[PDB]
Amino acid sequence: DLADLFPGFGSEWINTSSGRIFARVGGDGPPLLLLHGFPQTHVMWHRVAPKLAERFKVIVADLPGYGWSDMPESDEQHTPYTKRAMAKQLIEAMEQLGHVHFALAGHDRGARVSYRLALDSPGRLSKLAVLDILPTYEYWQRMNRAYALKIYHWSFLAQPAPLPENLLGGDPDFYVKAMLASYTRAGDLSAFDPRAVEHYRIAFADPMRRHVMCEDYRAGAYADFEHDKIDVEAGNKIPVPMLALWGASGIAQSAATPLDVWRKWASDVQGAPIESGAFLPEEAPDQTAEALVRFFSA
Amino acid sequence: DLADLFPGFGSEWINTSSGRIFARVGGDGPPLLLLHGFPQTHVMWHRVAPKLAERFKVIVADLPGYGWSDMPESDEQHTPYTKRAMAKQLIEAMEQLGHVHFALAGHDRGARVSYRLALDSPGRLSKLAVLDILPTYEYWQRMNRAYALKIYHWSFLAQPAPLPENLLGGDPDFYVKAMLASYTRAGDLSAFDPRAVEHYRIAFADPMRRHVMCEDYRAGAYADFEHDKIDVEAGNKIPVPMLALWGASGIAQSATPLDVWRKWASDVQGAPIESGAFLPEEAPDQTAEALVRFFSA
Numbered sequence: 001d002l003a004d005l006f007p008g009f010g011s012e013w014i015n016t017s018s019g020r021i022f023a024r025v026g027g028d029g030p031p032l033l034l035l036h037g038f039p040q041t042h043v044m045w046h047r048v049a050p051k052l053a054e055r056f057k058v059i060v061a062d063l064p065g066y067g068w069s070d071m072p073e074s075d076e077q078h079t080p081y082t083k084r085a086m087a088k089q090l091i092e093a094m095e096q097l098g099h100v101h102f103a104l105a106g107h108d109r110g111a112r113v114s115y116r117l118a119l120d121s122p123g124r125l126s127k128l129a130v131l132d133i134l135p136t137y138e139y140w141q142r143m144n145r146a147y148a149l150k151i152y153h154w155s156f157l158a159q160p161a162p163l164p165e166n167l168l169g170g171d172p173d174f175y176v177k178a179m180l181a182s183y184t185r186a187g188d189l190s191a192f193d194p195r196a197v198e199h200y201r202i203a204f205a206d207p208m209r210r211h212v213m214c215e216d217y218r219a220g221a222y223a224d225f226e227h228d229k230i231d232v233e234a235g236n237k238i239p240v241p242m243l244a245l246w247g248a249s250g251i252a253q254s255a256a257t258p259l260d261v262w263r264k265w266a267s268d269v270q271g272a273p274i275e276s277g278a279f280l281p282e283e284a285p286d287q288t289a290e291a292l293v294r295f296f297s298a
Numbered sequence: 299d300l301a302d303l304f305p306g307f308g309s310e311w312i313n314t315s316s317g318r319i320f321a322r323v324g325g326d327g328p329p330l331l332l333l334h335g336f337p338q339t340h341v342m343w344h345r346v347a348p349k350l351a352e353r354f355k356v357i358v359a360d361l362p363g364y365g366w367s368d369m370p371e372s373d374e375q376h377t378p379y380t381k382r383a384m385a386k387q388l389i390e391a392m393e394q395l396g397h398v399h400f401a402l403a404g405h406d407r408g409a410r411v412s413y414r415l416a417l418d419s420p421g422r423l424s425k426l427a428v429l430d431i432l433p434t435y436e437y438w439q440r441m442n443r444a445y446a447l448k449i450y451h452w453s454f455l456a457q458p459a460p461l462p463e464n465l466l467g468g469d470p471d472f473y474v475k476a477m478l479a480s481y482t483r484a485g486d487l488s489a490f491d492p493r494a495v496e497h498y499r500i501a502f503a504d505p506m507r508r509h510v511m512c513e514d515y516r517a518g519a520y521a522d523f524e525h526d527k528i529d530v531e532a533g534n535k536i537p538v539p540m541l542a543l544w545g546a547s548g549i550a551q552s553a554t555p556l557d558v559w560r561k562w563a564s565d566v567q568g569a570p571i572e573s574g575a576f577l578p579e580e581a582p583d584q585t586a587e588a589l590v591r592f593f594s595a
């Protein structure tokens with residue numbers, strides 16, 4: 001019922017102690033993990049993954065609780081869907097494949113999993129790439145009226161259950177599509193493959209998957225923030241050589257000077273703006289792929 | 299049929315150029331206007347209004363677009379549901395009854411209509427009372443992680459249509475009940491009268507009324523903010539002698555309310571009340587006496 005946007009890629013259901021992680025696996029060479037964000041799945045990499053496959057062994061994984069990944073039971077602190085736990089679970093997953101030192105690239109929620117992984121376990125990463133994000137700490141500290149209105153859903157979805165859930169039940173199709181079109185450059189869905197939008201909408205049409213997304217944004221308003229406050233108070237920087245890509249019309253640039261912020265969180269960081277909205281790998285696939293290939297190859 | 303929580307009070311469909319304002323009207327003496335808020339209707343004053351009617355001509359009106367008042371067609375800048383436009387419409391309504399200089403008390407959304415009225419047309423108000431609020435500018439300007447999480451619906455309901463409307467249409471009864479409960483001390487509907495809740499529920503059950511509420515919160519995120527900002531930068535303060543009532547466990551106090559209003563008013567008194575956000579329904583007696591003692595000085 002859902003299209004194949006990764007021709008040639010296999011399908012792996014990697015076992016962890018918190019549940020199965022689904023991923024499309026293609027190419028050969030150095031291991032490169034790709035992590036998606038909200039409200040998308042692994043298929044958001046379908047326009048750049050084949051190019052990366054020509055050079056690397058590309059693992060395109062659904063986040064814990066997302067897509068076809070299992071949904072581990074959450075708790076009163078939203079632990080399994082905190083960026084620290086997600087990182088632990090994916091580290092565990094990559095160990096099942098023999099990948100204990102790999103390249104990592106993330107977008108939105110996946111980028112947050114990524115930099116948290118780098119802080120907690122720098123050893124697991126050769127190079128890091130974060131796409132159109134700032135540290136979760138940075139958004140909350142810089143929170144103003146402009147901030148609050150634009151990215152309203154950081155506060156909205158972090159509301160205690162079942163208030164966001166019950167509201168999302170009203171028109172999940174509309175909401176998930178609105179979340180996609182609102183952060184592009186054109187303001188519509190033209191950037192997204194209609195088949196890819198189907199993957200997103202189908203997953204979002206399930207109440208259980210939506211609950212996970214809320215538990216995600218709850219973690220991002222509490223545990224993730226507290227985890228980030230500890231680091232920023234200690235003065236810990238990410239030692240992993242990392243790349244920061246953001247859309248010129250993206251979310252991160254309206255907030256701050258992206259590479260100036262990431263220089264405060266990482267000692268070895270380079271970055272560039274790309275003519276795009278928030279959804280870089282779909283809006284500007286050629287440039288995004290090129291940036292990643294050249295960076296991970298160096 | 300909805301309950302009549304105002305024994306003796308007549309009903310009024312007051313014509314304005316922007317549409318009819320419904321109000322319950324009772325008592326006699328100096329004229330006193332009561333303006334409700336979100337997500338309520340005029341029946342929120344039902345526990346304190348009779349006490350007030352012993353000494354005043356009490357006019358309990360539904361805000362334009364709210365409850366039983368008509369719904370003026372809105373526009374791209376949400377003009378008719380800005381606080382400036384609401385105040386003008388109510389000034390018209392009061393002028394119909396022969397009231398061109400009156401006393402005014404407001405809560406939540408209505409209190410924003412009220413101080414905006416004080417700023418734009420100070421001559422219209424003998425005395426002013428605002429309940430459990432800060433100026434709209436103050437909330438947006440002091441926005442942080444805490445306020446983002448604590449009062450999220452300022453940003454959520456302000457999202458461009460029809461994003462909030464389509465979400466609210468799913469489970470409207472749940473949302474309106476949660477909104478009433480969440481800001482009380484007990485965190486339930488126990489402080490409210492069931493019949494009052496049904497008034498709030500039925501109104502909130504109409505999708506057109508729900509759209510009006512969003513237009514209200516859209517105005518409060520933009521045009522209202524900008525209007526307030528103009529007064530901040532120009533050093534304009536409310537000359538109308540006012541009283542700032544707020545709940546000790548309410549929304550307004552979670553800043554030091556009296557200090558904030560002193561920046562906005564050159565003659566303002568302030569006192570806390572053992573209550574959540576809905577003082578006239580959580581602490582009706584303390585609110586009743588405070589209002590009576592203030593407008594009767």
Ligand SMILES: *[C@H](Cc1ccc(C(F)(F)F)cc1)C(=O)O
Binds near residue numbers: 109112135251255
């Ligand atoms: C996805 C949306 C998003 C993206 C980027 C930022 C910021 F401000 F950090 F750059 C905030 C929100 C997500 O929630 O991660």
Ligand SMILES: *[C@H](Cc1ccc(C(F)(F)F)cc1)C(=O)O
Binds near residue numbers: 406407431549551
């Ligand atoms: C009603 C809810 C409300 C009340 C008071 C405040 C604050 F923080 F300004 F005092 C915010 C929100 C309303 O929408 O005004």
